[PDB]
Amino acid sequence: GEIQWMRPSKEVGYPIINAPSKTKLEPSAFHYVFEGVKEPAVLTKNDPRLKTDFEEAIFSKYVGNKITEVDEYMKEAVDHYAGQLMSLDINTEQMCLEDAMYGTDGLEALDLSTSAGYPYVAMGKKKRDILNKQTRDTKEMQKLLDTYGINLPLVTYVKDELRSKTKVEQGKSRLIEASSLNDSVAMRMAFGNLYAAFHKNPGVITGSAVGCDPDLFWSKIPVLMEEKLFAFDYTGYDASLSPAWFEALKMVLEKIGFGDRVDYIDYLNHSHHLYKNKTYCVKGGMPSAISGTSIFNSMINNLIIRTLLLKTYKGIDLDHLKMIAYGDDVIASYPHEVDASLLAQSGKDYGLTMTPADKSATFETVTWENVTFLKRFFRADEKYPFLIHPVMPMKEIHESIRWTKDPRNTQDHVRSLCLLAWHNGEEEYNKFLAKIRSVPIGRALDLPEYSTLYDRWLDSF
Ligand code: NA
């Protein structure tokens, strides 16, 4: 991805977009009961903690576009992946407006708490004013589609979340690039059934984990993986994607019966954004918050890994490449050992910056003991080995519990963390609960005990 130009929005007929500047994150009642070093991300140019220009830092993710056309290895990757998706008999018909707005089997209703995007954010009109969960009314939406059309600018917001000390100082805040409600609706109508098929089929056929339930999915992954695992991290995946990867994605869509609306992908590839009082044009780079972001990043990841394998290992049998992606995150396997370092080398030529799995210093062999997916390790249950625990290290949970965005959601927030933590074992879980209960706020929470969560887990399969 590369920003073509940036200029005052007024110069191109757009209003100034008001974006938050004060974090809603504040120390929680557990701030001093648990250790952590993360703080709220810099949200404004004048944040005192900044040690470098903010604007420059947030847009530096756009490292450029390394490739223009779809080469022969990519075309082969496209054919193999598309052929694989064909086996799912994905319903290629457009999804009706109602289901696209309020959901259906395999697709949850539009989130009413997220931005409505342009021009609604500028007209002070909320989603709640347009959608009605109880009525499933499409009349108001339909008039808006007719009035403002599609392919509207994407509104950019700095994401309010916790970040490392370094990322705070370097102004490395992440951005929310929200599509207009009109575009979310149009894209969900165009690809609604594709989204549903993926959500209902997490695994090695879709090559996607989007919509998965880790508590149940983890026991299914090993049987899907090959004999040899391999993985690696991407540096700024979304923003590094070159236009050619979007074209390759369109080829897949065409081959599986959606050639009908590949135009929507152009809207993702060549897009314009509004940030504060500026407007800018980007070539390449996947927008962080459009409907289908994680699904398309996942599809593209399937194309990337297949491409690098073909380019690096001629004669590779893609029918034995078993991988599952969640955006840029991936867990992959092959009957034979492969060199991630070589794949990373080949990756640079395609505009991808690949590094050792989980921040490792060197490319090491990935095993069932050290592999992670969605930050979770895999650990067989002690009593029933066939049941696999998704294990997120307590470090992440501790970092998260030390802050709150709304005192009213304290119990939901803490319970959510408990659902993640108990997998670390009864001893650790109890220590976690004891610390929570070392302060008044924690003592007033209704939290599940270990045996309750274990029983509930067994009863969920
Ligand atoms: Na883009």
Curated annotation (Swiss-Prot):
Residues 227-342 form the RdRp catalytic domain. Interacts with Viral protein genome-linked and with protein 3CD. Replication or transcription is subject to high level of random mutations by the nucleotide analog ribavirin. Binds 2 magnesium ions that constitute a dinuclear catalytic metal center. The magnesium ions are not prebound but only present for catalysis. Requires the presence of 3CDpro or 3CPro. It is found in: Host cytoplasmic vesicle membrane. Replicates the viral genomic RNA on the surface of intracellular membranes. May form linear arrays of subunits that propagate along a strong head-to-tail interaction called interface-I. Covalently attaches UMP to a tyrosine of VPg, which is used to prime RNA synthesis. The positive stranded RNA genome is first replicated at virus induced membranous vesicles, creating a dsRNA genomic replication form. This dsRNA is then used as template to synthesize positive stranded RNA genomes. ss(+)RNA genomes are either translated, replicated or encapsidated. It is a peripheral membrane protein. The chain holds residues 1749 to 2209 of 2209 of the full protein. It comes from the Viruses. Its cofactor is Mg(2+). Mg(2+) 2 binds at residues 233, 328. Residues 1-461 are cytoplasmic. It comes from Poliovirus type 1 (strain Mahoney). This is RNA-directed RNA polymerase. Mg(2+) 1 binds at residues 233, 328. It catalyses: RNA(n) + a ribonucleoside 5'-triphosphate = RNA(n+1) + diphosphate.
